[PDB]
Each structure stands twice: as structure tokens, then as C-alpha cells.
Amino acid sequence: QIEDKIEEILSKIYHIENEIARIKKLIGEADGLIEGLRQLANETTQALQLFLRATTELRTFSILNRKAIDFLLQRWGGTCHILGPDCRIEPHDWTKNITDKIDQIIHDFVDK
Amino acid sequence: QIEDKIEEILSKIYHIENEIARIKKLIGEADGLIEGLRQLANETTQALQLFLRATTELRTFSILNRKAIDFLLQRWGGTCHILGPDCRIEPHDWTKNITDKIDQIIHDFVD
Amino acid sequence: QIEDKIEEILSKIYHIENEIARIKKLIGEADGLIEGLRQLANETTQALQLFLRATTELRTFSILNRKAIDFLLQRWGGTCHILGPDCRIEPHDWTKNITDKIDQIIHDFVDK
Ligand SMILES: [Cl-]
Ligand SMILES: [Zn+2]
Numbered sequence: 001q002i003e004d005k006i007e008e009i010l011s012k013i014y015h016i017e018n019e020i021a022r023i024k025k026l027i028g029e030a031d032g033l034i035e036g037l038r039q040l041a042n043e044t045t046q047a048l049q050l051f052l053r054a055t056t057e058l059r060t061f062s063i064l065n066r067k068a069i070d071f072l073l074q075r076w077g078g079t080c081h082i083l084g085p086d087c088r089i090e091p092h093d094w095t096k097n098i099t100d101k102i103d104q105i106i107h108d109f110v111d112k
Numbered sequence: 113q114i115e116d117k118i119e120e121i122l123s124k125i126y127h128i129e130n131e132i133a134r135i136k137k138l139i140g141e142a143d144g145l146i147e148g149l150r151q152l153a154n155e156t157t158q159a160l161q162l163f164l165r166a167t168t169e170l171r172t173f174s175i176l177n178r179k180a181i182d183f184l185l186q187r188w189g190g191t192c193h194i195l196g197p198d199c200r201i202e203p204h205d206w207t208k209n210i211t212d213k214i215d216q217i218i219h220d221f222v223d
Numbered sequence: 224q225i226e227d228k229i230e231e232i233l234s235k236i237y238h239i240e241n242e243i244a245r246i247k248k249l250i251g252e253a254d255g256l257i258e259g260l261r262q263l264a265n266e267t268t269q270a271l272q273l274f275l276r277a278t279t280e281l282r283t284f285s286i287l288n289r290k291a292i293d294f295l296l297q298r299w300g301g302t303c304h305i306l307g308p309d310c311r312i313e314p315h316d317w318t319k320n321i322t323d324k325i326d327q328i329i330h331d332f333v334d335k
């Protein structure tokens with residue numbers, strides 16, 4: 001019955017060999033799942049840089065249309081005269097702020 | 113050859129011991145991806161809020177430049193006269209739409 | 224001492240049977256994980272399409288405000304006169320560019 005305990009130890013090993021395989025099946029879809037995370041963060045970071053491009057072009061161009069509008073309304077007391085207090089509203093320069101967040105996403109996910 | 117079957121039983125146990133280790137590594141990886149997923153969704157959601165900020169300032173500011181241009185062109189039949197039917201085109205207010213989507217990404221991933 | 228090696232082989236099998244159990248306890252929590260990557264890429268791709276909509280409306284509307292400003296400044300030598308060389312700066316049409324990137328993120332992650 002030594003040869004018996006050895007046939008049982010062999011059955012165990014056969015069955016816990018089955019599990020190892022099944023397990024590997026579930027925990028299987030997970031390697032590049034990190035590489036897929038590094039790619040989502042890359043394309044995203046790319047579309048965000050095209051918006052910063054466009055967005056800063058609109059800001060400059062529209063601030064230039066106010067420079068012209070300020071000239072034309074001079075002969076009227078100025079823009080603040082024709083527009084009211086809204087003449088004070090101007091678009092901020094979110095370039096650096098937006099830039100720094102786009103750099104974080106990269107450093108944190110794409111360079112890693 | 114009893115001592116043989118016992119040397120093989122020992123090699124299996126050696127190899128299925130290696131798997132357990134490797135598996136624990138993945139079962140340890142996906143935690144990273146689970147977490148890292150909630151962080152990409154956070155930063156992204158942050159850069160999207162700065163664009164909503166910038167974008168609505170441009171919309172308001174440019175609607176105000178048309179209010180001035182509307183005044184100046186009065187002595188000409190009005191903007192619709194100088195510009196044609198495009199005088200009807202105005203930028204929509206996507207603030208709520210954009211806002212709802214940024215709220216989804218947060219609720220779904222950051223919270 | 225054969226019955227000894229058999230007692231040790233039996234202890235290992237007992238301990239590597241404990242791991243298999245504990246591992247099974249963790250494993251479960253990770254495979255909708257691939258459906259989580261597909262979802263971040265989805266919403267993201269949705270918020271980027273609303274910005275492309277907004278962004279192109281600002282560009283068109285602002286180019287139309289320059290058309291009006293070009294007319295009013297005619298009785299002065301033209302905008303290029305009142306504004307200088309910046310009169311040449313105009314906002315580009317990043318529609319296609321931004322569109323193609325949003326289609327990449329989709330194909331690669333949402334539709335994939
Ligand atoms: Cl404008
Ligand atoms: Zn001995």
C-alpha cells in the first residue's frame with residue numbers, strides 16, 4: 001500500500017493540474033490590458049493636443065476681432081459704452097493649465 | 113522504480129509551483145490595471161473640464177463681438193444684409209451636454 | 224525514508240492546494256476589466272465628439288465676425304491696416320484631423 005499512496009498522490013497532482021489550467025483561462029486576458037491602457041492614454045492625449053491647438057487659435061483670432069471692434073466703437077464712447085459691463089469679459093489663457101494636465105496623462109501613463 | 117514515480121511526482125509539483133507564482137503575478141497585475149483605469153478616467157475628466165471652461169469663455173466672448181458688430185452694421189441694413197443668411201448661424205450652448213458626459217465618466221470610473 | 228519523501232510530497236500538495244483556493248478568491252474581480260477599458264474609450268470618445276461640435280461652431284461663427292469686421296474697416300484701408308500683419312492669422316479647420324483621431328480610438332478600442 002505504498003504503491004497505493006503513490007497512486008493517490010498522482011491523482012491529486014492530475015486534478016490540481018486541471019485547475020491551474022482553468023485558472024490560467026480566466027486570469028488570461030490581462031497582460032496587454034496594461035498595454036491597452038497605455039494606448040488609450042496615448043490616442044486620448046493626442047486628440048487633446050489637437051483641441052488645445054484649435055482652442056488657442058480661436059482665442060487669439062477672437063481677441064483680434066475685439067481689437068478691431070474697439071477701434072470702430074471709439075467714435076461712440078468705446079465698447080464698454082455700447083456693450084455695458086460685459087465689455088470687461090475676456091477669455092483667459094488656459095494654455096499652460098491644459099498643457100500641464102496633458103503632460104501628466106502622458107508621464108503617468110504613456111511614458112510608463 | 114517506486115523511487116522513480118516519486119521523482120516525477122516531485123517534478124510536477126515543482127512546475128505547478130511555478131505556475132501558481134506566475135498566476136499570482138497576474139492576479140496581482142490586474143489590480144494595477146483596475147486602479148490605473150480609475151486614474152486615466154480621472155486626469156482625462158480633468159483636462160475635459162478645462163476645455164469646457166475655455167470653450168464656454170470663447171463662445172460668450174464671441175457672441176459679445178457680434179452684439180457690437182450688430183450695432184455698427186445697423187446703418188447698413190444690418191448684419192443679415194452684409195453677411196447674407198449666415199447671419200442666422202449662432203454657436204449652440206453645449207454646456208449641459210458636455211457636462212453630463214463628464215459626470216458619467218466620473219460616476220462610472222472615479223467614484 | 225521512502226515513506227518520508229511521501230509525507231513531504233503530501234505536505235506540499237496540501238499547501239499548494241491552499242494557494243489555489245486563495246487565488247480563486249481573488250481572480251474573479253478582474254475580467255470585466257477588458258469591458259472597463261472598452262467603456263472608458265467609449266465615453267471619452269463621446270465627450271470628444273461634443274467638443275468637436277462646439278469647437279467647429281465657434282470657428283465658423285468667429286470667421287463670420289471677421290467677414291463683418293472686414294466690411295466695416297474697408298473705409299480705412301482694410302483690417303490689415305488697423306490690425307497689422309496679424310490680420311492674416313485665421314483659425315484652421317481641424318475637423319478632419321480631430322475626427323480621424325476620434326475614429327482611431329473607436330476602431331482600436333470600442334469597436335475592436
Ligand atoms: Cl469672435
Ligand atoms: Zn537517507
